[PDB]
Amino acid sequence: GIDPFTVSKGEELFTGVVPILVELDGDVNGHKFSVSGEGEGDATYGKLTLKFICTTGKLPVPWPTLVTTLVQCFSRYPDHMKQHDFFKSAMPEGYVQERTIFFKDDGNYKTRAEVKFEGDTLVNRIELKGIDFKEDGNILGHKLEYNYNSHNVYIMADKQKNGIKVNFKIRHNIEDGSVQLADHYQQNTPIGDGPVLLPDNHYLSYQSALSKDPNEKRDHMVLLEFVTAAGIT
Numbered sequence: 427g428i429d430p431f432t433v434s435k436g437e438e439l440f441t442g443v444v445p446i447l448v449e450l451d452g453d454v455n456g457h458k459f460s461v462s463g464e465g466e467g468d469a470t471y472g473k474l475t476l477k478f479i480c481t482t483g484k485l486p487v488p489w490p491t492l493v494t495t496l497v498q499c500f501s502r503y504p505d506h507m508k509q510h511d512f513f514k515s516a517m518p519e520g521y522v523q524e525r526t527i528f529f530k531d532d533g534n535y536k537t538r539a540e541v542k543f544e545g546d547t548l549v550n551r552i553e554l555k556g557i558d559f560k561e562d563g564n565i566l567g568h569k570l571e572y573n574y575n576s577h578n579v580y581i582m583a584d585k586q587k588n589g590i591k592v593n594f595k596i597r598h599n600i601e602d603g604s605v606q607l608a609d610h611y612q613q614n615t616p617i618g619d620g621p622v623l624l625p626d627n628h629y630l631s632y633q634s635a636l637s638k639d640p641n642e643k644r645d646h647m648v649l650l651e652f653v654t655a656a657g658i659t
C-alpha cells in the first residue's frame with residue numbers, strides 16, 4: 427500500500443477531469459516507431475479526449491490498430507457496480523496491462539503497459555512488439571479505413587494474480603468493404619500490494635470516433651471515446 431495519508435486513494439482520484447499522458451514504443455516486423463498522446467479523462471462520464479502523434483515520422487501500421495493499446499480506469503462504473511471497478515482500485519500505484527492481439531490471417535501484437543499516476547497525471551507507458559505480419563497484408567500494407575466501431579469488452583476476475591482477465595474482438599474495416607478481425611487476450615495485475623476490487627463477470631461498452639486535426643501536419647490521430655460498465659442488473 428501507500429502513505430495512509432495519501433490525499434486521494436483509488437476512486438477518489440477520478441472524481442474530476444484528469445490529464446492523461448500516453449507513451450508508446452513499438453516494433454512491428456522490425457519497423458520501429460514511437461507515439462505520444464495527451465488529453466484528459468472524465469470518469470464520471472466515461473469520457474476520453476486524446477490526441478496522439480507519431481514522434482518518429484510516419485506510423486508503419488494503421489492508427490486504428492493501436493486504439494486498444496493506447497486507460498480503462500476512466501470507465502464510467504454505475505453506482506450499483508462500483509464494487510467491481512478493479513482499474514480505479516489499483517490506483518495510484520497502478521496496474522500492468524498485458525495483451526496478445528491476434529490479427530486474423532496475419533500477425534500478432536504483444537503489448538505490456540504500466541498505467542499509474544505520476545502526480546496529477548494518469549500515465550500509460552507501453553511497449554508493443556509485432557511479429558509474423560504480411561508485408562502486403564492489411565496492416566503493413568495500410569489497407570484499413572481510418573475509422574472505428576463500438577465494442578463490448580468482457581471482464582472476469584483472475585484471483586490467482588489478484589487481477590483480471592479480459593477478452594474481446596475488434597473488427598477493423600478494410601478498404602474493400604471487408605473486415606479485419608483482431609482477437610484480444612488481456613490480463614491486468616496490480617503494481618501495488620494493497621487490496622483491489624476483484625469483479626464479478628461484466629463488460630465495458632465502448633464508442634469511439636477517430637478524426638484529424640486540420641492544423642496538424644505530423645502523423646496523428648484525434649480520439650474521442652466513451653466507456654461505460656454494464657452487465658450487472
Ligand SMILES: [Br-]
Nearest residue numbers: 488489490572
Ligand atoms: Br490509418
Ligand SMILES: [Br-]
Nearest residue numbers: 497498499653
Ligand atoms: Br480505455
Ligand SMILES: [Br-]
Nearest residue numbers: 573574635636
Ligand atoms: Br470513426
Ligand SMILES: [Br-]
Nearest residue numbers: 627628629657
Ligand atoms: Br458479461
